[PDB]
Amino acid sequence: MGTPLWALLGGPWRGTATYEDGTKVTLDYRYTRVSPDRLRADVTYTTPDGTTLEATVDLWKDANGVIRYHATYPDGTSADGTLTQLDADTLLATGTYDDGTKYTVTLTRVAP
Numbered sequence: 001m002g003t004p005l006w007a008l009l010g011g012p013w014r015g016t017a018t019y020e021d022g023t024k025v026t027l028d029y030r031y032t033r034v035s036p037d038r039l040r041a042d043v044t045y046t047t048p049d050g051t052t053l054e055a056t057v058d059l060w061k062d063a064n065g066v067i068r069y070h071a072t073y074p075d076g077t078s079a080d081g082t083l084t085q086l087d088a089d090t091l092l093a094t095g096t097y098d099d100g101t102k103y104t105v106t107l108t109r110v111a112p
């Protein structure tokens, strides 16, 4: 079965993304739609160098049990990715932007 989709709903709705070089970015999010098979959230994060970015993210779990997401940004850009549970606290997120650029970050929910 793996990680239940609604596991993503718990705890404080804030986390940190850690990049390959150790850089960390804060993620603040708010769920706007919840159904047994699909979540949607508005996400805000401030990158290094101070740009503030907003995205709308749809999440679901495919029949192989993989948690997938599709993020859309105000400018029309999109990203498609997967979330893989590492331990109880952390997810591995790997995405591809519509320009072909890829990323890999870990996501950890801030402690309550």
Ligand SMILES: [K+]
Binding pocket: 073, 074, 075, 076
């Ligand atoms: K944008």
